Amino acid sequence: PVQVMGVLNVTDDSFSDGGCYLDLDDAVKHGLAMAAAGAGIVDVGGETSRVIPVVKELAAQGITVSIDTMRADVARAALQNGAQMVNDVSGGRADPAMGPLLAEADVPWVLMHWRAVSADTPHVPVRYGNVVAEVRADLLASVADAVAAGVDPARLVLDPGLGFAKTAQHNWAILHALPELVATGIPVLVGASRKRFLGALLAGPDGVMRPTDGRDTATAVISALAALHGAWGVRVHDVRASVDAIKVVEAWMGAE
Amino acid sequence: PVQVMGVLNVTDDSFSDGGCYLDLDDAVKHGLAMAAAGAGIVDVGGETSRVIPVVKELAAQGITVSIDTMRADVARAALQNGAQMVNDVSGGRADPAMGPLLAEADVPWVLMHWRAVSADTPHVPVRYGNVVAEVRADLLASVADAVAAGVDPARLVLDPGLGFAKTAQHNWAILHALPELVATGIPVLVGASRKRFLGALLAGPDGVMRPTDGRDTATAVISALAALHGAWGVRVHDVRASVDAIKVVEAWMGAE
Numbered sequence: 001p002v003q004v005m006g007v008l009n010v011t012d013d014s015f016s017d018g019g020c021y022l023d024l025d026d027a028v029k030h031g032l033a034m035a036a037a038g039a040g041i042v043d044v045g046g047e048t049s050r051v052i053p054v055v056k057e058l059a060a061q062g063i064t065v066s067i068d069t070m071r072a073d074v075a076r077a078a079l080q081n082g083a084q085m086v087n088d089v090s091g092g093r094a095d096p097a098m099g100p101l102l103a104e105a106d107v108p109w110v111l112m113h114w115r116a117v118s119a120d121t122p123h124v125p126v127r128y129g130n131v132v133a134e135v136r137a138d139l140l141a142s143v144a145d146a147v148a149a150g151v152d153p154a155r156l157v158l159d160p161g162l163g164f165a166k167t168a169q170h171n172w173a174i175l176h177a178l179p180e181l182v183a184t185g186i187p188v189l190v191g192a193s194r195k196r197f198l199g200a201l202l203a204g205p206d207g208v209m210r211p212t213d214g215r216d217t218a219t220a221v222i223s224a225l226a227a228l229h230g231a232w233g234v235r236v237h238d239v240r241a242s243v244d245a246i247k248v249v250e251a252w253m254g255a256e
Numbered sequence: 257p258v259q260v261m262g263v264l265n266v267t268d269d270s271f272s273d274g275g276c277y278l279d280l281d282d283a284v285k286h287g288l289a290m291a292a293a294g295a296g297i298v299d300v301g302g303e304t305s306r307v308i309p310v311v312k313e314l315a316a317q318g319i320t321v322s323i324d325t326m327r328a329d330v331a332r333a334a335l336q337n338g339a340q341m342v343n344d345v346s347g348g349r350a351d352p353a354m355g356p357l358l359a360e361a362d363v364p365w366v367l368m369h370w371r372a373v374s375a376d377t378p379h380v381p382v383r384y385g386n387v388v389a390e391v392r393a394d395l396l397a398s399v400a401d402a403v404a405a406g407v408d409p410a411r412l413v414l415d416p417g418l419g420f421a422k423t424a425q426h427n428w429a430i431l432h433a434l435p436e437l438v439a440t441g442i443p444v445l446v447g448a449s450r451k452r453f454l455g456a457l458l459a460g461p462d463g464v465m466r467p468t469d470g471r472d473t474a475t476a477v478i479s480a481l482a483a484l485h486g487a488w489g490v491r492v493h494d495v496r497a498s499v500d501a502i503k504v505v506e507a508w509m510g511a512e
C-alpha cells in the first residue's frame with residue numbers, strides 16, 4: 001500500500017506548482033476534495049495565520065493533516081490545532097527546536113533531503129559525485145539526529161527532496177535507485193509532482209517546458225513506478241491521477 | 257522502444273471511446289496532431305468512402321497509417337491509398353481473403369485475439385478456464401494460419417484483444433502475464449485505451465463509471481507497465497499521455 005499525500009498550498013505564489021488556496025474556504029474545499037479523491041494525508045503548506053485555520057477545519061473534518069514547515073513554532077501551532085504529521089523540508093536542520101518538538105509530540109516526521117552548498121545558495125544545485133550515496137548518507141545522519149532527540153525511528157519518513165539543490169539528472173538517478181533507499185527500512189516518500197524536471201522532460205517541440213498542469217500524467221507514472229519499487233508514499237497535486245495510477249498497478253500486479 | 261499507435265475513429269458513434277472524426281478535415285487534423293504528439297502509427301478505423309480519403313491524406317503527409325478493418329476489400333483499398341499496416345480485429349478470421357492480401361502486400365498485420373462462443377454473440381464474454389493460455393494458443397494458431405497464407409512471420413503483430421468477449425478480470429490476467437505473450441517472440445500490441453474495464457476500475461464513489469475522457473491516466477500507466485514488460489506497442493486515444501508515460505519510464509529506467 002502506498003500513501004497518497006495531497007498538496008494544499010495555502011500561500012499565494014505566482015510560480016506555484018499547484019493551486020493557491022489562500023482563501024480559507026477554497027483551501028478547505030480543496031483539502032476535502034483531495035481526501036475524497038483518495039489522499040490519505042493532506043499536506044498544508046504556507047505563516048501561522050494562514051495555515052492554522054485550514055489545518056483546524058480539515059482536522060475537524062477527520063482528515064489526516066501534515067504541516068509542511070521548517071519552523072518548530074508553526075509546527076507546534078499546527079499540532080495544537082489537529083495536525084498529525086510534520087513535513088520538514090529542512091530535515092530538522094533549519095530548526096533545532098524541531099526534533100524536541102517531534103519527540104514531544106510522537107507523530108510522524110518527514111525528513112526531506114536538502115543539502116545546500118551554502119545557506120545563501122539553497123537552490124544552486126549541488127555538484128554530487130554520487131547523489132544516491134550522498135543523499136542516503138545525509139538522510140541516515142538526519143535520522144540519527146532525530147533519534148538522538150528522543151524521536152522514535154518508527155515515526156520517521158525519508159524523502160530524497162527531488163529538485164532541491166538537485167538537477168533533473170540527479171532526480172532520475174535517485175528514482176532509478178529508489179530500491180536502495182527503500183532498503184534502509186525507513187519509509188520513503190517521493191515528491192516529484194509537477195516539478196521542473198518534468199517540465200523539462202516533457203518540453204514541447206520548440207523547447208518550451210510543459211506547463212505545470214500538463215505534468216500530471218508523468219507525475220502519476222512516477223507514482224506507479226514508486227509503488228512498484230516499495231515507496232511508502234507519494235506527495236502530489238493531482239490526487240485522482242496518482243490514485244488512478246495506483247489502482248492500475250494493483251490491478252495489474254495482483255492479477256493472479 | 258515502444259510504438260505508439262494513435263486511434264483515429266472516422267465513424268460517427270454515440271458510444272465512441274474517443275472522438276468521432278467523420279469530417280475529413282477534422283480527422284486529418286487529428287491524425288497529424290497525434291503524429292506530432294509522438295504517435296509513430298495512426299490507426300484509421302471506419303466504410304471505404306469514409307476512411308480512404310483520410311488514409312490518403314495522412315499517407316501523403318508522410319504518416320505511417322494502419323487500417324483498422326476486418327474486410328480484405330477495405331484493407332486493399334487502404335493499401336492502394338498509402339496505408340502501411342493492416343490492423344485486423346478478427347485476426348484474419350472474418351475474411352479468408354485477408355491473409356492472401358497480406359501475403360501479397362508484405363506489410364505488417366496485427367492479429368487481434370477475439371474468440372467468440374458464436375458469431376451471433378461476439379460480445380458475450382467467453383468463459384475461460386485459463387484465459388492467458390487460451391489466448392496464447394489462439395493467437396499462435398492465427399499466426400500459423402497467416403504463415404500458411406504466405407505471410408512472413410516477421411510482419412506479424414499479436415494483440416490479446418482486451419475487452420473483446422473478455423471481462424475486466426480476464427483483462428487484468430492477460431496484462432499480468434504480458435511477459436508470457438511477449439515470450440512468443442512475436443511483437444505484442446496492447447489496446448487497453450479507455451476501455452470499459454478502466455471505467456469500472458475507476459468508478460466513482462457512487463459506482464458510476466469513470467467517463468471515457470477520464471480513463472487516460474490509467475491508460476498511460478498501462479502504457480508504462482507495458483513498456484516495462486516488453487510490449488512492442490500501445491494503441492491509444494490520448495497520445496500525449498502515453499508518450500509522457502513512456503518518456504518517464506525511459507528516464508527512470510535509464511538513470512545509470
Ligand SMILES: Nc1nc2ncc(COP(=O)(O)O)nc2c(=O)[nH]1
Pocket residue numbers: 007009016017018068087088089110112159161162189190191192193194195235
Ligand atoms: N516532503 C516533501 N515536501 C515538499 N514540500 C514542498 C515541495 C515543493 O512542492 P511544490 O511543487 O508544491 O512547490 N516539495 C516537497 C517534497 O518534494 N517533499
Ligand SMILES: Nc1nc2ncc(COP(=O)(O)O)nc2c(=O)[nH]1
Pocket residue numbers: 263265272273274324343344345366368415417418445446447448449450451491
Ligand atoms: N489491434 C487492436 N485494434 C482495436 N481496434 C478497435 C478497438 C476498440 O477501440 P476503441 O476503444 O476506439 O472503440 N480495440 C482494438 C484493440 O484493442 N486492439
Ligand SMILES: [Mg+2]
Pocket residue numbers: 007009016017018019237
Ligand atoms: Mg504547490
Ligand SMILES: [Mg+2]
Pocket residue numbers: 263265272273274275493
Ligand atoms: Mg475510439
